[PDB]
Amino acid sequence: MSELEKAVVALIDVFHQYSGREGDKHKLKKSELKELINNELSHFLEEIKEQEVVDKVMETLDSDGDGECDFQEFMAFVAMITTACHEFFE
Amino acid sequence: MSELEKAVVALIDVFHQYSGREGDKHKLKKSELKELINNELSHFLEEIKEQEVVDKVMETLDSDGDGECDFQEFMAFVAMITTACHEFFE
Numbered sequence: 587m588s589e590l591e592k593a594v595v596a597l598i599d600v601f602h603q604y605s606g607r608e609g610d611k612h613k614l615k616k617s618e619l620k621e622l623i624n625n626e627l628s629h630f631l632e633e634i635k636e637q638e639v640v641d642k643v644m645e646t647l648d649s650d651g652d653g654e655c656d657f658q659e660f661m662a663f664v665a666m667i668t669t670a671c672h673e674f675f676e
Numbered sequence: 677m678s679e680l681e682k683a684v685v686a687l688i689d690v691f692h693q694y695s696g697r698e699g700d701k702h703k704l705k706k707s708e709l710k711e712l713i714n715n716e717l718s719h720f721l722e723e724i725k726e727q728e729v730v731d732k733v734m735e736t737l738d739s740d741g742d743g744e745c746d747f748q749e750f751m752a753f754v755a756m757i758t759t760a761c762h763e764f765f766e
């Protein structure tokens with residue numbers, strides 16, 4: 587597999603390392619999303635320590651109002667992160 | 677860096693391995709997009725041999741009508757691919 591192809595599976599891998607931990611196995615609730623960010627995006631994103639900060643990140647990502655981040659909402663999150671990296675973090 | 681963090685840079689790396697080859701250094705024209713697909717997505721996508729097929733893929737990706745695929749349009753492409761992989765390719 588190519589680097590692109592490996593990167594694609596890595597995106598799917600990380601979603602499920604976190605999504606299956608609690609409740610709905612196919613969505614990241616706030617507590618799972620916090621965990622993912624703090625453990626998998628520690629170099630790209632400031633550590634989330636306040637519940638308020640998890641809420642605001644989840645409000646941004648949650649396009650269907652169920653209070654959770656599903657896979658396509660996660661893909662939009664990845665697009666935000668990648669775009670920011672691409673821009674050398676503003 | 678985490679696997680997620682490495683995957684993010686890999687997405688940026690591959691865009692530029694192909695985007696800088698011809699013309700506008702920050703966009704993939706059809707010929708660059710064909711090259712990327714055939715060389716970097718050979719396990720996920722059928723090889724493109726016909727110009728018609730490049731055109732139709734580019735028509736799908738090109739949201740601002742400039743006939744080229746920029747970075748955010750590339751990110752949507754990646755979202756399509758990842759979603760398809762996630763779905764075990766329908």
Ligand SMILES: N=C(N)c1ccc(OCCCCCOc2ccc(C(=N)N)cc2)cc1
Nearest residue numbers: 628629630631632670674675676677678681
């Ligand atoms: N030895 C290690 N484990 C290690 C140390 C640093 C590292 O770094 C990778 C480069 C990331 C570049 C970080 O760039 C920014 C700038 C601003 C913001 C912001 N506040 N929005 C966020 C990120 C990777 C691994």
Ligand SMILES: N=C(N)c1ccc(OCCCCCOc2ccc(C(=N)N)cc2)cc1
Nearest residue numbers: 670671672673674675685686688689690692
């Ligand atoms: N194999 C490679 N090419 C490559 C591999 C690792 C790397 O490590 C970057 C550490 C993260 C810091 C921010 O990463 C970027 C990278 C590229 C762009 C860009 N060209 N837009 C913008 C931001 C950089 C390039």
Ligand SMILES: N=C(N)c1ccc(OCCCCCOc2ccc(C(=N)N)cc2)cc1
Nearest residue numbers: 587588591718719720721722760764765766
């Ligand atoms: N030894 C090698 N170099 C190698 C061989 C196979 C491989 O495979 C990875 C798994 C990809 C699974 C492929 O699954 C589909 C199913 C349907 C379509 C479709 N027609 N849309 C596209 C892809 C990777 C490396």
Ligand SMILES: N=C(N)c1ccc(OCCCCCOc2ccc(C(=N)N)cc2)cc1
Nearest residue numbers: 595596598599600602760761762763764765
């Ligand atoms: N470290 C890992 N976990 C892992 C690493 C590599 C891998 O190789 C898959 C080859 C590509 C074939 C299609 O890949 C997928 C993978 C996961 C899902 C899913 N769970 N939705 C859907 C499709 C699978 C899992």
Ligand SMILES: [Ca+2]
Nearest residue numbers: 605608610613
């Ligand atoms: Ca869950």
Ligand SMILES: [Ca+2]
Nearest residue numbers: 648650652654
């Ligand atoms: Ca949602």
Ligand SMILES: [Ca+2]
Nearest residue numbers: 695698700703
């Ligand atoms: Ca170009």
Ligand SMILES: [Ca+2]
Nearest residue numbers: 738740742744
């Ligand atoms: Ca365009």
